């Protein structure tokens, strides 16, 4: 029933006596049980792909069959875990081996098989008809998340003849007996799923609810809807780590799945050392972020197939967590590396190249992968709802954006947050080049603004035109100097500078400017536009703007200092203070005109 090796060639192996094997089964080739997958079947012999190094193999070694394609186990215990590209626990492996290597031919359960979990029955009873995707019990996973639900895997129906009652169990105790034509069906606290097949869902919806990150510029001018895609350039000096950290700590999501898809290694060490120290404070300083995140690490040494399947694994995990009714936020690291791995695999298979040497799959693969994102209502009885929002990170070949990867990604995604290094030295620490970055979810977000903040769109637009006008104005200012410019032009210029240095720039470490909520930013841009338009109106009827600036230097300083105002104090008393400041500015301008 086993298979004897018949040939070997680097990473290529040919089995024998293989009858009754699918085209993508998994096989435990070798005495050490190296993992592999069948590719081509020709009668009895079948080509096999290996992951580890094949040195030392010998003809006649038995070959086994797993019985499924590449799959990932899902269940309680994912949180606080650090995984390889192919669902391999690294902490447990290191502890078990006591070495500092990944000893080839090592197999340990993806999830711990010893920790006892306290299960609580759901809402069904014996003899009740059931359908796939229906919740039938919860589990307390952490103080942060305590409602880790238990589903019935899709493609499974029937009636339940026995359900275990409350108690404490491990992951190897059948807690349900679904009866069908064959009553063989048993179920435990976990199950598996092929990675390459998208999870079934009742129906997709239209994402409209905004995703707020806590930054000012992001949600002010280039918002991302909670459920959509986005892209940000990958550079060394840009310092994207700030964006990822802020998204992890201050966003309104409920589960983060960071994916390292091939890095220099040392960067992986840095991020792994850093994450367990980031702290969030909601209803008290809930110490870790690891209690809300699972991380997939893939250094360059990792096997090519593992380095390639990383994003598929991550997105599958995200979809699983979405179907529980929670909100998820995937974050890739370098899609360029994933494309590199895909091209390397294609080349090793010896297939026809395409544009710039890449294969022909890239377009379709990326399109499908991105389409896997979105917002939908889960598949089950309770009718919960979730959402997924991928955040890609494209790195170029050598800076140029002519590569197919960048073109396809930009064509697919909807939001781009351009980062510039030049701002780094000037320390606009949120280093967003406002002349390039853009968003396309405004048309939907207006249907939320009107319900909550009707004036937001006109204000954000107004500052968009203000910034464009100021940057254009400076061009001719250099040519002819400010001398030949009217007072209105100088007003535009200086208000643009004030906005640049207050509204956009953000320390990110001060207790007050670390995390700016929505209403606070609402008040800020309202106040800034009011100041500018009131000043220009006052100048319109006739007045030397120099004298006006001399009179209202205090008002300008007050509006600037309003940014230093500490939020998290009343969250409506702040609104009262902002109203007081606005009225004070109005009456000060009125008196100044006199």
């Amino acid at each position: 029933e086993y298979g004897a090796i018949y040939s070997v060639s680097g990473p290529v192996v040919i089995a024998e006596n293989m009858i009754g094997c699918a085209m993508y089964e998994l096989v435990k080739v070798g005495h050490d049980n190296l993992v592999g997958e069948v590719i081509r079947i020709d009668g009895d012999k079948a080509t096999i792909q290996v992951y580890e190094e094949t040195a030392g193999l010998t003809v006649g070694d038995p070959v086994l069959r797993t019985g499924k394609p590449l799959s990932v186990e899902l269940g309680p215990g994912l949180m606080e875990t650090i995984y390889d590209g192919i669902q391999r626990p690294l902490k447990a492996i290191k502890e078990e081996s006591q070495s500092i290597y990944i000893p080839r031919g090592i197999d340990t359960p993806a999830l711990d098989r010893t920790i006892k979990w306290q299960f609580t029955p759901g809402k069904f009873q014996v003899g009740d008809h059931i359908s796939g995707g229906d919740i039938y019990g919860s589990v307390f996973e952490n103080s942060l998340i305590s409602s880790h639900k238990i589903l019935l895997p899709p493609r499974s129906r029937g009636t339940i003849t026995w359900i275990a009652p409350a108690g404490e169990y491990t992951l190897d105790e059948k807690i349900l007996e679904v009866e069908f034509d064959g009553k063989k069906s048993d179920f435990t606290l976990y199950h598996t799923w092929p990675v390459r097949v998208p999870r079934p869902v009742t129906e997709k919806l239209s994402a409209d609810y905004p995703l707020l990150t806590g930054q000012r510029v992001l949600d002010a001018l280039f918002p991302c809807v909670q459920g959509g895609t986005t892209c940000i350039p990958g550079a060394f000096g840009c310092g994207k780590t700030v964006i990822s950290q802020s998204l992890s700590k201050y966003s309104n999501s409920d589960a983060i799945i960071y994916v390292g898809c091939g890095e220099r290694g040392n960067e992986m060490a840095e991020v792994l050392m850093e994450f367990p120290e980031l702290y969030t404070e909601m209803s008290g300083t809930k110490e870790p972020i690891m209690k809300r995140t699972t991380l997939v690490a893939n250094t360059s040494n990792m096997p090519v197939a593992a380095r390639e399947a990383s994003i598929y694994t991550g997105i599958t995990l995200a979809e699983y967590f979405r179907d529980q009714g929670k909100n998820v936020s995937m974050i890739a690291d370098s899609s360029s590396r994933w494309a590199e791995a895909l091209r390397e695999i294609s080349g090793r298979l010896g297939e026809m190249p395409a544009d710039q040497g890449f294969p022909a799959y890239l377009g379709a693969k990326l399109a499908s992968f991105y389409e896997r994102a979105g917002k939908a209502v889960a598949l089950g009885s309770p009718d919960r709802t979730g959402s997924v929002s991928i955040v890609a990170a494209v790195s170029p070949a050598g800076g140029d954006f002519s590569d197919p990867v960048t073109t396809a990604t930009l064509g697919i995604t909807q939001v781009f947050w351009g980062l510039d290094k030049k701002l780094a030295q000037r320390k606009h620490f949120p280093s967003i080049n406002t002349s390039v970055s853009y968003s396309k979810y405004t048309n939907v977000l207006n249907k939320f603004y009107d319900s909550n903040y009707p004036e937001f769109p006109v204000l954000r637009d107004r500052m968009k035109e203000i910034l464009s006008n100021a940057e254009e104005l400076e061009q001719v200012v250099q040519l002819v100097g400010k001398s030949a410019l009217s007072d209105s032009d100088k007003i535009t210029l200086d208000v643009a500078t004030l906005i640049k240095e207050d509204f956009l720039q953000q320390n990110g470490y001060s207790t007050y400017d670390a995390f700016c909520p929505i209403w606070k930013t609402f008040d800020m841009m309202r106040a800034f536009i009011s100041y500018h338009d009131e000043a220009q109106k006052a100048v319109a009827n006739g007045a030397n703007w120099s004298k006006l600036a001399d009179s209202t230097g205090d008002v300008k300083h007050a509006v600037s200092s309003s940014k230093f105002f500490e939020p998290s104090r009343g969250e409506k008393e702040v609104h009262g203070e902002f109203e007081k400041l606005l009225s004070t500015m109005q009456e000060r301008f009125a008196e100044s005109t006199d």
Partner: protein
């Protein structure tokens, strides 16, 4: 301590060795046995030609009862009637002992210092398993190269991987020799060691390396793996694996801060293209095999500090761009895998500047973790930026001098013009045997900075300006 039980268990067990006489065809650098029994991929074999000469090889493929051996030292003189092929029964292994230091090894690891055998303390598989990422940490402290233009502006934190790009006809080898000779830690040594493996080099360069390392005493801190140009290519691809394996053993089983150098990778790329042409894998981009990314990653990414052990490791691969273009695949991949790069300009070399390094394109991403207090003085990070900015300004000022005279230039422009020449002629220009500590280089940089008025050095913090600008 129980390692003795394992050593004896697999130690005192002799096994026989087959011997074949069924050579049944040959194709260039290959050889095709016919009726092997239970072959084993990637074995080691010892051919015996009819004249009594002896060679070696390593299988590549196995059909049903067949092997395809490739011989290291060519294939001329073999025959299909009298040659006898002897199998080994286990892959290539290296003899490892603490006392490599001082000795010189050939490409395959046979000592060539007219000394006794290694007296191995153990045996190992050359290409070990990858490091577990979860058990890895960040660089922290600095390594003292002794070169002014490197340490001051491109410090190397232990655990980094900084390649040194260079052109064909440049003195990169001399720079590498000087670096290996002057390396060491910083004391604001009983823990330092170097591995210096050279692949694909002339005879003169090898002799110069040996003679210089002999009479300069550095030999007993190093262990060279020389491989001349006329030696088999397979041995060439093998050599870096041996060097990395021995360095890893030392670092992570004796807790020694070690530094490794390679002195070339283009010739490694050539040796690699040669393989997969013996096989029928069609050529990739620019003729190179497509899958070089994986194996180059394997070579490089056995570096960095480790969680538990106190040891460490560092790499300085040396490339050679064919026609001085970064677009070539080799430098592209190396930059992709490694952190920052060190350039070597041709023009500076033409002007007699040694080491002919240009700093404008240079970069080291882990600097920020290298400099600091205790680990070094407090003013390194500011002087670095200041000097970089002023050099950049001086270049363009010299450019404009020819078009707009000299008087129209601002006072800033004249000062920068003078500073550029002074910097080039004094700071970077370092004697072949002039060794400088980081402190001395910092002092010289301060001396050069003293050209400008105190106020104007904007990029430097006022605290440092007040503290050190005096005198």
């Amino acid at each position: 301590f129980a390692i003795n039980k394992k050593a004896v268990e697999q130690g005192f067990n002799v096994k026989p060795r087959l011997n074949y006489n069924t050579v049944s065809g040959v194709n260039g650098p290959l050889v095709i046995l016919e009726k092997v029994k239970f072959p084993r991929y990637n074995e080691i074999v010892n051919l015996t030609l009819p004249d009594g000469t002896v060679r070696q090889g390593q299988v590549l493929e196995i059909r049903g009862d067949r092997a395809i051996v490739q011989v290291f030292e060519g294939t001329s003189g073999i025959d299909v009637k009298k040659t006898t092929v002897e199998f080994t029964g286990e892959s290539l292994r290296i003899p490892v002992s603490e006392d490599m230091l001082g000795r010189i090894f050939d490409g395959s690891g046979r000592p060539i210092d007219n000394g006794p055998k290694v007296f191995a303390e153990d045996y190992l598989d050359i290409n070990g398993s990858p490091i577990n990422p979860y058990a890895r940490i960040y660089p922290e402290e600095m390594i003292s190269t002794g070169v002014s233009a490197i340490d001051t502006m491109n410090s190397i934190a232990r655990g980094q991987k900084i390649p040194i790009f260079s052109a064909s006809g440049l003195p990169h080898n001399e720079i590498a020799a000087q670096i290996c000779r002057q390396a060491g830690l910083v004391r604001p040594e009983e823990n330092f060691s170097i591995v210096f493996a050279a692949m694909g080099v002339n005879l003169e360069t090898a002799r110069f390396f040996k003679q210089d390392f002999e009479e300069n005493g550095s030999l007993e801190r190093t262990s060279l793996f020389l491989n001349l140009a006329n030696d088999p290519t397979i041995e060439r691809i093998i050599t870096p694996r041996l060097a990395l394996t021995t360095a890893e053993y030392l670092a992570y089983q004796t807790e020694r801060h070690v530094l490794t150098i390679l002195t070339d990778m283009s010739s490694y790329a050539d040796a690699l293209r040669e393989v997969s042409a013996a096989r029928e894998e069609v050529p990739g981009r620019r003729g190179y095999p497509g899958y070089m990314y994986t194996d180059l990653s394997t070579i490089y990414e056995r570096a960095g500090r480790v969680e538990g052990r106190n040891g460490s490791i560092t790499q300085i691969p040396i490339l050679t761009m064919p026609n001085d273009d970064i677009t070539h695949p080799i430098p592209d991949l190396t930059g992709y895998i490694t952190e920052g790069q060190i350039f070597v300009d041709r023009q500076l070399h033409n002007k007699g500047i040694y080491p002919p390094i240009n700093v404008l394109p240079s970069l080291s991403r882990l600097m920020k973790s290298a400099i600091g207090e205790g680990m070094t003085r407090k003013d390194h990070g500011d002087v670095s930026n200041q000097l970089y900015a002023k050099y950049a300004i001086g270049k363009d000022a010299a450019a404009m001098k020819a078009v707009v005279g000299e008087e129209a230039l601002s006072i800033e422009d004249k000062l920068s013009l003078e500073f550029l020449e002074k910097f080039e002629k004094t700071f970077i220009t370092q004697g072949a045997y002039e060794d400088r500590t980081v402190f001395e280089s910092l002092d010289q940089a301060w001396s050069l900075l003293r050209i400008y008025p105190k106020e104007m050095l904007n990029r430097i913090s006022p605290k440092i300006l007040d503290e050190f600008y005096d005198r």
